[PDB]
Amino acid sequence: RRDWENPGVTQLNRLAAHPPFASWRNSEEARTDRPSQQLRSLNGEWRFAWFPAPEAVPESWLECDLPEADTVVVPSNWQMHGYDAPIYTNVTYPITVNPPFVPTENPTGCYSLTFNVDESWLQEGQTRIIFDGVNSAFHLWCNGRWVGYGQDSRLPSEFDLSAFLRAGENRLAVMVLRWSDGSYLEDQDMWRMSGIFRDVSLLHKPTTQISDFHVATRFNDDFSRAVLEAEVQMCGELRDYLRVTVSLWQGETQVASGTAPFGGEIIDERGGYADRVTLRLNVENPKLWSAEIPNLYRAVVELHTADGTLIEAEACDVGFREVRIENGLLLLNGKPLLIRGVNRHEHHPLHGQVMDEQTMVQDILLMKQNNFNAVRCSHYPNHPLWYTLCDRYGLYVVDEANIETHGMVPMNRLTDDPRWLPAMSERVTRMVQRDRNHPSVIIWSLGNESGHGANHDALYRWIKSVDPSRPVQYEGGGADTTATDIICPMYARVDEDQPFPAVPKWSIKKWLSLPGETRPLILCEYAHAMGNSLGGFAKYWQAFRQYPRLQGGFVWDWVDQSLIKYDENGNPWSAYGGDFGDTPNDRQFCMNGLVFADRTPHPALTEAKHQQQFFQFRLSGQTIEVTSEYLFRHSDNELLHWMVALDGKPLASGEVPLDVAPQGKQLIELPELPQPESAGQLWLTVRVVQPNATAWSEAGHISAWQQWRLAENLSVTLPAASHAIPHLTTSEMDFCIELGNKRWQFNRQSGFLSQMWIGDKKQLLTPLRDQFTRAPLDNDIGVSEATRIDPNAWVERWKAAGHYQAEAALLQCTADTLADAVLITTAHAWQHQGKTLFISRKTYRIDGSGQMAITVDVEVASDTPHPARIGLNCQLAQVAERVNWLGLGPQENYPDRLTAACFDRWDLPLSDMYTPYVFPSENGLRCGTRELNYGPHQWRGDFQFNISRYSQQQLMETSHRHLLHAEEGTWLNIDGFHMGIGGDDSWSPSVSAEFQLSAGRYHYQLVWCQK
Amino acid sequence: DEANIETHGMVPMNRLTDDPRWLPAMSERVTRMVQRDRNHPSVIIWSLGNESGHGANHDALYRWIKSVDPSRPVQYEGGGADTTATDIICPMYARVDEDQPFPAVPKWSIKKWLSLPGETRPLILCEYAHAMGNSLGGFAKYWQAFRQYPRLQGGFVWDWVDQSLIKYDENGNPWSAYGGDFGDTPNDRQFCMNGLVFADRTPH
Amino acid sequence: RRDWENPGVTQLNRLAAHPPFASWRNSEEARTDRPSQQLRSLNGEWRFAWFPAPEAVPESWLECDLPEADTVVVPSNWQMHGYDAPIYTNVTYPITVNPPFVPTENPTGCYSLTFNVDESWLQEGQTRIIFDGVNSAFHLWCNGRWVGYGQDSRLPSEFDLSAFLRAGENRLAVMVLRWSDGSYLEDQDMWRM
């Protein structure tokens, strides 16, 4: 029997699902949540052996250990141990579409564990084993005897071993199959791995036991009063003296309690549940749970004799909160949420899909520290501890079924098929039964990218039926189907309609007001953070803030799915699709996070932090108006820091305590500001600082900022009179300019400044030349394969237009001598195949002061695709340690992604000026720069620039950051103009029109000089 | 057209139908009936089964049908006759004028039933007028009510033909047998004969 | 595998359900509803033998007729031929309530049919067998070969025998279980056959 090829069979002998248990035999321990003697981890070293197929597994293995087996850690993904390659496929199934069949060649991991059990366990009650995560299906044997089977890689599979075990030494044998019929339901956009990847354990329950419990909180009109209802079920002989006591604690204070014998109310003609009972506990002025104030209580469920003897106790944390959609708004505790979310897979660059607390905690804190308040379990129920952490630190969670059939044709091929309803239902039901008591979980989701089938409808109703406390959403088939309480599209744009057939993605603002539509809209995915991305992020926020029913969304996504590999000399590097011989593959498309796999942030994180700020500011004269977007807490750990500077030079500064009630306002008037008579721009910057530490942040933490330009005093003063007057020396091939120790040289054949010297030091390795292209961003590439070309992608368009290959054609080059200067005038034509793409016209004006002033005017053919940038570039001979500038920063910032950055005086190590995106592209840009200083060089004007040891060409030819090599000297890219980077999606052009270089005529000017 | 699902003997009645583990088996009993009979014009209403209390399985299956075949109303009497798994108030044995206020699953008078606050559905009895033996007394009363109230749209009498079986005596003569006649026990004796006609189709 | 005690298994290898087909190869006949050559009845005389439990059934049966069997009409209810007794219970299940388990003593009707098929059937196309109603669960074998399993006493259970059939003489062996996990969903107020 090939059960792994029968969606009709998803388990055998498996126990029913339930909420997390520990069988504590001491109430006190349960209360304190101390560890339970009844719950043992079998995590650690296990025996493992790999086979190409299950038929290759040796019968002996069941009775005895294979000498050839190795000793490995569990949990783990075998690919992480090197047994076989991890595969990175997106939509396309990693195996042949032939449901419910799987390949004959099906990697099989045979696991085994030798262990002991004490008689105690054995002499009375129940001994069961729990496999938190097994990928994708598996058979289990104990002491040579087969126990059962299980499917669904993302939920615990449980079996009773009571009758398999013997005092002392026991042996587990787990035959784990890489693929199965459950795989047709596990087509998520991630690495395809396998193994015993989540905890293994053993739990002891008494014969008379708590088999299930449901915790509910209902409130009065103003939440000033609550009723906690606890439904408790038992297994065991039914007896009159049996009782249940449910007690509620706030810290060490017991706030409520109730006890009762089993026997629920009459429910139908045949009676009620004699094995159940419901406790109702009244709670006055309960402390409510939210992500802003994760207040929790402890619920302790005791199963005991009337007369006092405790049989066992189970327990959980409880968050009193109400989730509800009313009049088109998702409310929490009666207030409308504004979701600052992120999608997050369970990914680890070293361990793969194994999740540890450390990592979890870390993810949580960065998210909180970055203004996120919610997370989506893309696209499967997560490791148990995750929910507990969310409960405690405070995050809103979308709990999602492990059901993704994206590779099908059409997408709802299985979900619309009744024959698959059973396997699907279990993916939904068991999730619910497991996580229904976590307050963090506020919405249930039916899975992902599985089209829309009758099955979804059934399942949707099932949930609503069993747990009315939470809304249910699902994006499949159009995002606004009958199977979802929220309009939850992926990648719908703010203002821009994408009217695909059957499943259009309307402008989010238009979507809300479609006739008959009334639901709230929360994007299940938006702002694809792939590489140099997140352009247009603020646009979403502004809309979320203006329209009440736009209650936010979940960014796609949290961390890059990169895996660490090693080179010939044991140095580690970041790998993506195909880097393991895996094919077909989807290359870098598994890398779309705000942070790198090691959790180091991408520059975009900051953009996200800013836009998601919880405090809003307006300036009027010297009064700042602070508005609070907190729904529940007052600004009780916040201070306002302000500062005024003139061109980077600090004039004044102060700090003000924030005292803003949620949704409230606070006006802050600044002291008269000092008056400088000195020319330039005064800038005001404000930062909200958290004086004290929290469980998720260090004291001094900065949570919000904003900047404004105050007065400006135009410099009317005249530069100082120059003693010298530079000299020009002509030759047929060049024009040379000389002033003191400085000289410039311009090639007459090419029309460029080809050399500059300080003293006798040349300053350039490559001539200063115009630049209209960039090493393409992932967003510029979109899908566009080389086997498969997408003609509408930017890169493709640029490529086809010859942008990357046009050659400069000199139209003119001349020299004039001024009163106080030499003037070089040039003109070039950029053509491709007889087409004039661009025209550049310049003048170089060097005066007796040694300042070279470059004025540039370009023309762009209206019928050529809008160029990536309009600037100049050159390779400097020099390599300096720092880069100092007067403009936006300090981090990388692009035109459509620069709100977070601040204008000021920045000074970093050269290296911070490069963004080590794993898939290399244009990066490190800084906008709104008025002054840039490198080594003895200094540039002035109003531009954007980048500077690194890497040319655009290298960047463009290398696909892995580890393969980059510093070139001689430093490449400088100075732009008068730079195209937006986009990112509404990473597979169609996404740069908004306002950020495209379509004006046709461009002008800029810079002053190059020394210091 | 009614799904093959009846869990009458459970305690409480919805013990299985409300358990997700039984959703799969149950699902097939409905889905498969629909796939088979859906082109039949005579079938005008789908039933989720009989006497299985009211469980979440019912709701999901209810929805599966609505979704798959919107051409026909779906009914189910279990758990009260007016739950969320039924488009028609379809009680068994509710009386005309007399209320029988059973706990949890009362059988209101049908006329009163229709007008309960917020109730708007049509009401058609899945079973009424138990024709067991010398019976059918008060039949007219239903008819008068069905005729006067628009939303009282009729019902299905219980039931058509006596479930008696032929047995032969020593002298090989036949005779109608019922519960217990075959050594069968426990048994419900004459309870299997509630028809308007005898087993051989001769009318009562 | 005691598939009849696992509500997780309600069939094995069963084809998908669908409306009544006849596979006509002529439009006029389909229109007029005439009988169709592609659809053939196996009702008639079959061979039968009664056992008290699935375990009492001998393997011989799979390969060959059981001398002890009788020739009976099909379709039929074995309680009507005297093999065992019909049961009349209303609410209380006819078996002990302990889902998904059934009694160890569980009456088994071993049915069999020797028959032939047109060669052309063998040649090309698909040949499936359709059982309109089997109470309550059954295992099916063709020419010794195990074909599949089915539950739900009131809907047709269909199997492809394209691969099991053979030139001329074929033998079907149907092992039918009185009780099954299906019985828990079949508690209707009527005779239990």
Ligand SMILES: *[C@H]1O[C@H](CO)[C@H](O)[C@H](O)[C@H]1F
């Ligand atoms: C939304 O799309 C992103 C694109 O990278 C991933 O494929 C997610 O799984 C999908 F739900």
Ligand SMILES: *[C@H]1O[C@H](CO)[C@H](O)[C@H](O)[C@H]1F
């Ligand atoms: C309605 O009750 C009658 C009583 O004879 C029958 O038992 C039916 O099966 C039930 F639906």
Ligand SMILES: [Mg+2]
């Ligand atoms: Mg299977």
Ligand SMILES: [Mg+2]
């Ligand atoms: Mg997908």
Ligand SMILES: [Mg+2]
């Ligand atoms: Mg079964």
Ligand SMILES: [Mg+2]
């Ligand atoms: Mg009944």
Ligand code: NA
């Ligand atoms: Na909003």
Ligand code: NA
């Ligand atoms: Na992706």
Ligand code: NA
């Ligand atoms: Na590249």
Ligand code: NA
């Ligand atoms: Na009427």
Ligand code: NA
């Ligand atoms: Na009856």
